[PDB]
Design an enzyme around this catalytic site. Structure first.
Site, PDB file in Angstrom:
ATOM      1  N   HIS A 195       0.732  -1.079  -0.037  1.00  0.00           N
ATOM      2  CA  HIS A 195      -0.099   0.158   0.041  1.00  0.00           C
ATOM      3  C   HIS A 195       0.775   1.133   0.136  1.00  0.00           C
ATOM      4  CE1 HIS A 195      -3.364  -2.405   0.868  1.00  0.00           C
ATOM      5  NE2 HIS A 195      -2.898  -3.100   1.642  1.00  0.00           N
ATOM      6  N   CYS A 248       0.052   2.274  -4.532  1.00  0.00           N
ATOM      7  CA  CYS A 248      -0.685   3.343  -4.753  1.00  0.00           C
ATOM      8  C   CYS A 248       0.116   4.435  -5.016  1.00  0.00           C
ATOM      9  CB  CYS A 248      -1.758   3.777  -3.862  1.00  0.00           C
ATOM     10  SG  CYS A 248      -3.015   2.202  -3.700  1.00  0.00           S
TER      11      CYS A 248
END
Ligand SMILES: *[C@@H]1O[C@H](CO)[C@@H](O)[C@H](O)[C@H]1NC(C)=O
Ligand SMILES: *[C@@H]1O[C@H](CO)[C@@H](O)[C@H](O)[C@H]1NC(C)=O
Lengths: 409, 409
Positions: free
Chosen positions: A121, A163
């Site tokens: 992430h 991301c």
């Protein structure tokens, strides 16, 4: 020279199976190409293989063909030792600055090459590390400059799956470091997740969690399906870019970006990933958002149960936590800039090629002030990192940020 | 025959000055055209003219030229008497079903014409009424069918200024009622607010609240600038449509819609609005969202003060309340349909021409269940009405809605 690698999963939890699955697959790939285990540093929390929810105890797979990638993966930095501080120390190759773990580091020579792969992430300018730690892009750049200045390698290739991972390098990655970088996404897109429960291509039915990440399996399945003494770094970048774009549908895919020294793209991949002697000689994938996979997993669990209400109440708490963070951030924008200007300010994306934030120390300070008042960001809360950076860039003082955060929280 | 009118502001509070400003202007317009006061029923909460925040005590204006529209406006239904039940009873013309107020009703004859103008907040299938009351479109349709069936008028024209106001008539407004309708917006757009503190054209500097609504001032300033014995209903619709579209920029404007009996568009406007004997013989406006004007007003107040922190904490509570509602609704969608399908279901808009909801009794029930668990919707919460309608249309039972609401709240 000698080929080295650092493989990092920045997450933990069974919902995040895929990130350690990616890293374990990358390890087996590099061993098959003749890299040696002593030169490959593996960071994985290591809570997956024997997780109580794992339908194949002791086994991790990274795509629907179901081959185990866990056996033989070394335990270099696991559990509490998966930290940015240990990652930085491993890359610098100074064993004395490591805390815990195996002590394996990249104590490489000027003729050596290094390959770094990170998978989890992230958000604007930041990468996740297990249990609410945040890794800031500029600190990572600083480690590369330090390593370069000590003459520690000839060239380095970095692959980043997260991301908004373009924002880790845009406007700040120097090109004179003999380092070439690709990212799963540009500075504002999210990263996409593949081989999930309920999508095609179908993972084995017993799995409730996604097996892999789109950019990650794209480069790994590309490497293992080609002769790496012939395939160039550029050819892999091209192939990975097309596959990750998912038929150029950016609502279902992302833009793979490249940074650093593009002259390295002319080099054969085996210089970085080794070569497998056996390699002598597509549909649109159904993918999900990195930030959405956790809830899809809890919903898969909810639907397959009978405690059924315990899972639901945990889904409720997860969504409510996210709503609290999203609202707190939006309200801070309202208090600082007024309604009608808070969201434009917090959500504006700088032009490509500019740094996310002008004062990286300010970025860390805003996060600190936020979390002291509004609670921990979590991994999900890195989605708000561009908002904090935009507060910094706006010239709003730390004193005014404090006041807004106290009113908001 | 005799010309009648009903003028309704569905809101109260100084933040909503404009809605009673609109209604008061419409009253003065109709009097100037020769309609008689005994035939014009005015619903206004009446908390504006003497509000402690009103910089012109006893005066209400509806555009920057600053002419008072309050003097002479009758007090028919004010305060607690501004109710849907009183509105329905006024339209039916049965004085015995009115509660409170003046007792004035539309006890009209078969040759009479009626003009209805409503101005405030709304959402899908619903209109606001002061102090958290909601008026459901189908009940309004039912009143028109009842009034028509009693032979109470020759023709009727209805103008509705509210968010998503097309949804009050699409798929449910019959064309055989001698009723013609226009709405500020289509079934999914919001309505726009004009003459606000900080925009051009500039309201007088002492005002902290917006003076009028885009569609409303568009038809009123069009009527008063033309000879209504010559202008047709269709010409006003055309002019109002163009002005409300704000240079056909739907991010800053909306689509004016028409429903009912379009044959009425051929009629001269004076049959409905009277005629003023003196009438013998443009820039893009800066506008704001109906749902955003309240916070813009509190921010105007914040910026002009010195209690300065009392206002801010009230801004914080307002945003936090909205976040609670938005999150509760989103979570109910997640619990009912799963992540990744909750928002598609709750936010899908039916094709134009179809009714918002197939069971209007179900819609009211879902609202009831929500508010019992999650608290009052408020005026802002009508934005979630399409979500409740979509739960109804999905066939989810009331029993499952109850369970989701208890988990969510
Ligand atoms: C790549 O090498 C070429 C030499 O042919 C040089 O002109 C160029 O500046 C180099 N680019 C970078 C980014 O170092
Ligand atoms: C309007 O009147 C015409 C008569 O010329 C008729 O043909 C038409 O059906 C009417 N339309 C409506 C909606 O009543």
């Amino acid at each position: 020279g000698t080929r080295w690698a650092v493989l990092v999963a920045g997450s933990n939890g069974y919902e995040n199976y895929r990130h350690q699955a990616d890293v374990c697959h990358a390890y087996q790939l590099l061993i098959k190409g003749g890299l040696k285990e002593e030169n490959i540093v593996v960071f994985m929390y290591d809570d997956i293989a024997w997780h109580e929810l794992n339908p194949r105890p002791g086994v991790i797979i990274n795509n629907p063909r179901g081959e185990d990638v866990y056996a033989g993966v070394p335990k270099d930095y696991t559990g509490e030792d998966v930290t940015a501080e240990n990652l930085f120390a491993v890359i610098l190759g100074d064993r004395s600055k490591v805390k815990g773990g195996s002590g394996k580091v990249i104590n490489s020579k000027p003729e050596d090459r290094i390959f770094i792969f990170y998978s989890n992430h992230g958000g604007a300018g930041v990468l996740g590390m297990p249990n609410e730690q945040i890794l800031y892009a500029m600190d990572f750049i600083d480690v590369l400059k330090k390593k370069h200045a000590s003459g520690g390698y000839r060239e380095m290739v970095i692959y980043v799956e997260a991301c908004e991972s373009g924002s880790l390098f845009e406007g700040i990655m120097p090109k004179d470091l003999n380092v070439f970088v690709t990212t799963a996404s540009n500075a504002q897109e999210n990263s996409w997740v593949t081989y999930c429960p309920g999508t095609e291509p179908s993972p084995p039915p017993e799995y409730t969690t996604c097996l892999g990440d789109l950019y990650s399996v794209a480069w790994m399945e590309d490497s293992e399906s080609h002769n790496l003494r012939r395939e160039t770094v550029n050819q892999q970048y091209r192939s990975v870019k097309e596959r990750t774009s998912n038929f150029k549908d950016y609502a279902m895919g992302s833009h793979v970006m490249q940074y650093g020294d593009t002259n390295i793209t002319a080099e054969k991949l085996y210089l970085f990933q080794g070569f497998d002697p056996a390699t002598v000689n597509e549909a649109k994938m159904e993918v999900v958002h990195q930030r959405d996979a956790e809830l899809l997993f809890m919903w898969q669990m909810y639907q397959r149960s009978n405690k059924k209400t315990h899972i639901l109440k945990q889904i409720a708490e997860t969504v409510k936590h996210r709503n609290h963070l999203d609202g707190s951030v939006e309200l801070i924008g309202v208090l600082l800039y007024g309604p009608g200007k808070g969201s434009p300010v917090l959500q504006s994306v700088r032009d490509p090629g500019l740094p996310l934030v002008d004062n990286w120390a300010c970025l860390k300070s805003m996060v600190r002030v936020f979390e002291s008042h509004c609670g921990s960001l979590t991994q999900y809360g890195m989605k708000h990192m561009r908002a904090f950076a935009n507060i910094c860039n706006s010239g709003v003082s730390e004193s005014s940020m404090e006041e807004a955060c106290m009113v908001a929280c």
